[PDB]
Amino acid sequence: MKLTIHEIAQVVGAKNDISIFEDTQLEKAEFDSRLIGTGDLFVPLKGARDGHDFIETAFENGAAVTLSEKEVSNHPYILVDDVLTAFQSLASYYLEKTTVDVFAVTGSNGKTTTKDMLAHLLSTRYKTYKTQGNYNNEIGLPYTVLHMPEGTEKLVLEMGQDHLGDIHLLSELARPKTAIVTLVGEAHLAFFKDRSEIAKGKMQIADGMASGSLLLAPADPIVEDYLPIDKKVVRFGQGAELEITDLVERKDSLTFKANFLEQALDLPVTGKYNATNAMIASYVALQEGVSEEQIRLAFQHLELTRNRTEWKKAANGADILSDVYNANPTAMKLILETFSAIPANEGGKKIAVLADMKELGDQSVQLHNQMILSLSPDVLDIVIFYGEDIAQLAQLASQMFPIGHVYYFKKTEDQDQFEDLVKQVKESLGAHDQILLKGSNSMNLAKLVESLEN
Numbered sequence: 001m002k003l004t005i006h007e008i009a010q011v012v013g014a015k016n017d018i019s020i021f022e023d024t025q026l027e028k029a030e031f032d033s034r035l036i037g038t039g040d041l042f043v044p045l046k047g048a049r050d051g052h053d054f055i056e057t058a059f060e061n062g063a064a065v066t067l068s069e070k071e072v073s074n075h076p077y078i079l080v081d082d083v084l085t086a087f088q089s090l091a092s093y094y095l096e097k098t099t100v101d102v103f104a105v106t107g108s109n110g111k112t113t114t115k116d117m118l119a120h121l122l123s124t125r126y127k128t129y130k131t132q133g134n135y136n137n138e139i140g141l142p143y144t145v146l147h148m149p150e151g152t153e154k155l156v157l158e159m160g161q162d163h164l165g166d167i168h169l170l171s172e173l174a175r176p177k178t179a180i181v182t183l184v185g186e187a188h189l190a191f192f193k194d195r196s197e198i199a200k201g202k203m204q205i206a207d208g209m210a211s212g213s214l215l216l217a218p219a220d221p222i223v224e225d226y227l228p229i230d231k232k233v234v235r236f237g238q239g240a241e242l243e244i245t246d247l248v249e250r251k252d253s254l255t256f257k258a259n260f261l262e263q264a265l266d267l268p269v270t271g272k273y274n275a276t277n278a279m280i281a282s283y284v285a286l287q288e289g290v291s292e293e294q295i296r297l298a299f300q301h302l303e304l305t306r307n308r309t310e311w312k313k314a315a316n317g318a319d320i321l322s323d324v325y326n327a328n329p330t331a332m333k334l335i336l337e338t339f340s341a342i343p344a345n346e347g348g349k350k351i352a353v354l355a356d357m358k359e360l361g362d363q364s365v366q367l368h369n370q371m372i373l374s375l376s377p378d379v380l381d382i383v384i385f386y387g388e389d390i391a392q393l394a395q396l397a398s399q400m401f402p403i404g405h406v407y408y409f410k411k412t413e414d415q416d417q418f419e420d421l422v423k424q425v426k427e428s429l430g431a432h433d434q435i436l437l438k439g440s441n442s443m444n445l446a447k448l449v450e451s452l453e454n
């Protein structure tokens, strides 16, 4: 990073002083103590557990200073009213100091997100950084900003939303030079009411943009009432300014033609939507000085993006929600608070399969028990646990939940009831159920998700 502790303190409105501390140039920002290095800035957030607990473990790992809502003593600390707010203001300031061009994209997808594609095309001419994984919310975006390599010219930021107004905040924080909305109306769409509202929240991606900035929005009418007034708006889709005039899909390949492009394009993936993503990403890449040739070559060696947590279905008509990455307690807690917000389907049955999260440290077991506060008997009908460190949590669940609503399957270097787990899961899994699957990845967890799909 390119910041110093007094700088940060000044930018954040430190309630303490800082003059008392060294005022040393910092290395990088981390909210995961387990990630801190020598000279890093520690940012304690409210997660599975409060981050403030880990402050000490932070300096032990190298922290040179720490944000904090309370006096730290005998340690360099910047005192603020709220650490997340402080973290966001700081990311915002870093954007102003850097003057990097920001490209906001909203709407993940699956195989190859617009975010990765666009970042990929920009990489052909510029030093470009992007949102890693799914770090696209009020914690992830700020984080992505601060981890931007020195000299970045193009920053592609993906922005997700759980509640209306989430994107408005992100737009205001990042101030995108250009923005893209891919949209689609969610089904059981938890926390959100209906398509129009999802579209309303996504169109907020424009709120923090300067007048005349380019914004790509789909042809779908669902966004009409939310269009910005003083922006350069380009519509994509059949009939719109930008459109796919021809498409061909192989078994694992794709070839399509975009009206504004004179040549065709090839992608190592299959999907009408991937084509559109590629197209809209191309348009923005073009506006930034990238040639159709450079673009054409780049799509030659794209790069698939490991599934991307979303719904799917097991040969049964089930609603499988397998959260792939982010194997940490906060992520689990969050995936739980969401999965348990989505009301049940037809019949109305809710199931969650939780497994061990490796590498949590000597605090692993305690961290798994913490999930108990995120498990409600009323909303979840069956919770199945698979592992070792998660056993104490299963025991807690068996006491808190009704008789018979919990299951536990062993998994150690001695024994592994993977056999019985699949058997049990398959048995409980009804054709109109929603099964949540979360836990560090493993050969078995993968086989299990497959026994459902097959």
Ligand SMILES: N#Cc1c(NC(=O)c2cc(S(=O)(=O)N3CCOCC3)c(Cl)cc2Cl)sc2c1CCCC2
Residues within 6 Å of the ligand: 031, 032, 034, 045, 046, 047, 048, 049, 050, 051, 134, 135, 136, 137, 139, 140, 141, 143, 326, 328, 329, 330, 331, 332, 334, 360, 361, 363, 367
């Ligand atoms: N409590 C807690 C812990 C962690 N929490 C997170 O790493 C964390 C994760 C997320 S996230 O994974 O859900 N989020 C990220 C960036 O944005 C997208 C997803 C968000 Cl929000 C906040 C946070 Cl504090 S890691 C870890 C512990 C306990 C001790 C052992 C290691």
